[model samples]
Target: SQSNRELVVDFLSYKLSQKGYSWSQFSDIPMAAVKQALREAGDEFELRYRRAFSDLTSQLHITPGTAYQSFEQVVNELFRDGVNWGRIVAFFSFGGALCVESVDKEMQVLVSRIASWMATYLNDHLEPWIQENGGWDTFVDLYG
Candidate 1:
């Protein structure tokens, strides 16, 4: 039960991060410190949006025939009929995973910031659109 509680709390921390911030886990450290880190991260995101977009689009180089073509799938899913909050969810999941890999500080920081950007993008440019679409779903039919 404690592990499940921790997992839920950790998941909430991640949701807060999607609003342009980050948080440390419920470890020996205090929650206040985690809140401070998240607040400062949100500030940094507002300051860097435009410049980051230019690079993100370039780095996302997409080829129609490649797996990379998922770019279209993502955009159509998230941006076409309106924003895809699922894309925001997926991006943060990706960033969190990158940081959790125990990379050096520089890369760790980068992923944290990238996660923030995903949050900011959803908040600033996508939410209004997202409101027009069906919300995301995580359930999958499984056969074993």
Candidate 2:
């Protein structure tokens, strides 16, 4: 369990560090949930992604055929609504896990595209939010 937890923490840490942050702000985010998400995706990648992606698209009103473009819109909308950074991180990590499990070239490419989009969105959108929320240390203090 700790290994699985570390797996996600490591991934999230790298993503955050790329933007001059760290996983220290993620203490408030339950590792159990991330572990579960990772396990489910690893167990049934396509099925898990289908359900999660469907929920995401439906909730954000993103059209199915244009997820590549619509993903940015979805992230922007969620950022505007004050969605927590932790949840956003989880979303991307979960998608990424699915990408790792993808076997089909086309499916791999599709999920990889989505993963890249989420990474860019984190750097573009959530970076400022993290800083504005008094940076990572303050975020940990408040949310942790």
Candidate 3:
């Protein structure tokens, strides 16, 4: 349920980027309302995910380049041991929210964040292990 909220927020963030808006300017729905829905869902794990992302975002000193680079590292490292689609979706979603909240909301920043996630997901989730023994791709192919 928490991941669901993250997904919705991430999706909304992407949609806003496409429409030339930021999360703060989005007024169609209140964040409190959405948060309330999340609370009612009663999923403790979701809150942990949300809290983790929130903590990371608050700690980051973000700029366009830094956002891209930081997410790039996260994405790459996330798959180094193999992919987790659950984590991929969660991380990408959470990471997107962070980008949207950033001081630099350039299209590149948003795109770069997603790109980093997808690149890592593909590298780890889709690449077969028969081709590279013990590679994250291999592990993901078998277990991801």
Candidate 4:
């Protein structure tokens, strides 16, 4: 089931850790191209939507155990106008922001769960649309 879930994870993990110049460097493989694209897309989202992202972060009170439901509700709302590259990247940023809050609160155990939740949501709810639109390759072209 290599359904581009790694793409989503790669995007968020780098977005979260890159601020400190961590060892999360990209590889020189085929999928690495998509990885680079995901990074850039996420960066652009952060740069362009700083205000909005900050607003959402302040509004979302993510306790350790109740995060999945909060993520589900907010993500559903983000895509209510239908999915697109902008919304998708913002979704990744949202997850990244949530992880930051979790780690800050000493709830690092929630990080992997948050990642799994996001990948499952993408695979279950958004994969078909993504594939129809030519997958992450198209994403690279559009927003890489």
In candidate 1, the residue pairs with backbone N, CA or C atoms under 3 Å apart (3 or more residues apart, or in different chains) clash, namely 78-84
Model 2 per-residue lDDT tens digits across residues 1-144: 343335445554444444343234335345545444444433343343445454554554422255655667655554566656455545555444334333222333344344455556666666577668765455445434
lDDT of 4 by residue, 31-125 (tens): 98878877888787788677646666666666765756677876787789888878888888888877777777877666677777888888877
Per-residue C-alpha lDDT of model 3 across residues 1-144, encoded as one tens digit per residue: 333344345454554455466565333334444434323232333455655465556555455456445655655554577645444445445555555564244444454445344445444443343245553333234332
**lDDT of the candidates, in the order given:** 0.38, 0.48, 0.46, 0.73
Show model 2 residue runs off by greater than 4 Å: 1-53, 58-68, 97-106, 138-144
RMSD of every prediction: 14.6, 11.3, 10.8, 3.9
Cα-based lDDT at residue 46, candidate 2: 39
The runs of at least 3 residues in candidate 4 whose Cα sits more than 4 Å from the true structure, single-residue gaps closed, are 1-3, 21-29, 58-60
- Model 4: how far residue 109 lies from native, Å: 1.1
* TM-score (all chains, Cα) for each model: 0.33, 0.44, 0.39, 0.82
Model 3 clash tally, residue pairs:
2
Full ranking by TM-score: 4, 2, 3, 1
Q: Which stretches of candidate 3 lie over 4 Å from their true place?
A: 1-48, 58-60, 103-144
Best candidate, TM-score:
4
